[PDB]
Amino acid sequence: IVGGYTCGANTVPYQVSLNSGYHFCGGSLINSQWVVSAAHCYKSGIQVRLGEDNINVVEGNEQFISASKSIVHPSYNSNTLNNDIMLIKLKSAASLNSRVASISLPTSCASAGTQCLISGWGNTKSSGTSYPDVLKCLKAPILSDSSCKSAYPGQITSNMFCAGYLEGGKDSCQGDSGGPVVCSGKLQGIVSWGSGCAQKNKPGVYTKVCNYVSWIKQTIASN
Ligand SMILES: [Ca+2]
Numbered sequence: 001i002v003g004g005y006t007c008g009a010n011t012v013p014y015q016v017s018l019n020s021g022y023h024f025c026g027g028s029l030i031n032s033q034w035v036v037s038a039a040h041c042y043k044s045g046i047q048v049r050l051g052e053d054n055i056n057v058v059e060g061n062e063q064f065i066s067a068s069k070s071i072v073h074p075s076y077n078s079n080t081l082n083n084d085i086m087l088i089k090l091k092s093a094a095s096l097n098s099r100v101a102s103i104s105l106p107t108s109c110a111s112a113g114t115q116c117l118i119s120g121w122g123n124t125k126s127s128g129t130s131y132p133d134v135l136k137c138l139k140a141p142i143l144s145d146s147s148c149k150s151a152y153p154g155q156i157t158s159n160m161f162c163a164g165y166l167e168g169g170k171d172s173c174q175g176d177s178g179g180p181v182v183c184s185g186k187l188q189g190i191v192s193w194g195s196g197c198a199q200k201n202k203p204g205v206y207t208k209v210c211n212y213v214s215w216i217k218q219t220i221a222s223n
Pocket of ligand 1: 054055057
């Protein structure tokens with residue numbers, strides 16, 4: 001997260017860290033046994049880390065649970081990043097409390113202008129590299145589809161939306177991918193891609209979760 005603020009420990013209780021010996025992507029807990037992330041974060045041997053603030057220090061509220069199965073969307077295209085979404089089943093159910101909690105799925109798509117919360121452990125610089133150990137947060141609005149398509153000609157599908165600031169300076173970045181975009185208490189987006197981080201006229205692009213609710217529910221019900 002570039003241009004954000006320190007969330008505060010366990011103030012984003014649905015945020016997860018995907019760990020393969022190190023943090024490599026975020027995700028969101030949608031019920032006691034299932035996480036949603038980005039398909040481009042797929043790899044074998046994932047351990048899901050819940051209840052994290054500092055990812056390098058054991059602070060007392062963590063739950064570390066291995067994945068038993070990963071399901072990448074059937075129509076994911078790694079070249080265009082269309083359908084950049086993936087489900088992960090935990091080997092055992094997480095214990096839900098105030099600091100580890102699920103985020104609701106949307107019943108409606110959010111409109112441009114809605115303010116959302118984006119969070120992650122990704123790079124905090126637009127030029128250079130500095131990775132934080134504690135969770136960072138950014139408040140940002142959904143941009144109009146016209147502005148998004150103007151920023152990224154020929155690249156935006158109906159399964160994506162832009163959020164952030166055309167002036168730049170505030171954005172998601174590498175290492176935030178897979179993490180949540182939450183608006184009015186519902187999961188509306190997944191951190192997917194962009195051209196650099198926090199550059200003028202290049203906002204972040206996010207998977208549009210409301211298009212996938214039926215697939216998520218049907219997949220969870222039968223796996
Ligand atoms: Ca920790």
